Amino acid sequence: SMEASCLELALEGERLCKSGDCRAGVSFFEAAVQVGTEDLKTLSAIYSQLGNAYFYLHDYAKALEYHHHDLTLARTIGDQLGEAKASGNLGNTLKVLGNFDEAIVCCQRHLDISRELNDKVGEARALYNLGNVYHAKGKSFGCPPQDVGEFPEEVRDALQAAVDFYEENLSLVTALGDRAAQGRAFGNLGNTHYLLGNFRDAVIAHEQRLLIAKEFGDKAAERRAYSNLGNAYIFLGEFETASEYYKKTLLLARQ
Amino acid sequence: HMEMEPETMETKSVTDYF
Prior knowledge:
The complex is a heterodimer of chains A (255) and B (18).
Chain A: H1 2-18, H2 22-35, H3 40-56, H4 60-76, H5 80-97, H6 100-116, H7 120-139, H8 146-149, H9 153-176, H10 179-196, H11 199-216, H12 219-236, H13 239-254
Chain B: no helix or strand
TPR repeats (chain A): 6-39, 44-77, 84-117, 124-165, 183-216, 223-255
Region (Important for interaction with NUMA1) (chain A): 4-255
Keywords (chain A): Cell cycle, Cell division, Cell membrane, Cytoplasm, Cytoskeleton, Deafness, Membrane, Mitosis, Nucleotide-binding, Phosphoprotein, Repeat, TPR repeat, Transport
């Protein structure tokens, strides 16, 4: 039937994206769309795959559109988890585009549904996703030195809010034992502090990020941590310190 | 200026049927 062949093409697409070549994976997903199916669970899944595929490819407009169809459809068939997820992805995409307000609503939904269903895994991710949004939002005021000295309570509020999500996230992910996740949260938590002017707090966060990076054998994350650490010391005045972390950074990407 | 961590996207599979 047309079901079977649509099922095949998607399955392929998954292994293709799973194995690095998402460009071709997209094509197989689109193809499976072109074939189509009376099973909307499956279709829903496929649009999602496309949404992310295209997200990774930096074509955010198309990701938005594919997740919006996913979201709609999950609502259509009463798939709460599916709606939680599609929300998340749409939210993140909206963040990337700079439509923070609607992004917040979308990520907020993801959270609420994940709480309802008592999905702690999903709950924590949404907490991280929200973190990034409020971060991005507060970050996108004017430019990122004169900032830390003077800026509006409604921007503070936006950043402090991220901090609160990150911390909550962290807490959650300590329970689930997810080192990777602590990795991500720590980094962004630190930059958020950096902007807020909490530089000693910044360091702590990135030291944890670095440690976790080293533990995973992750050079890019090592690459960053040193970088972000350089910046904070600079703001405390420790230039000889900064000088070295910066050296390590340049020294790293070499290796 | 600052270096940030990647996003997480939740992910659905066809294999969820199985």
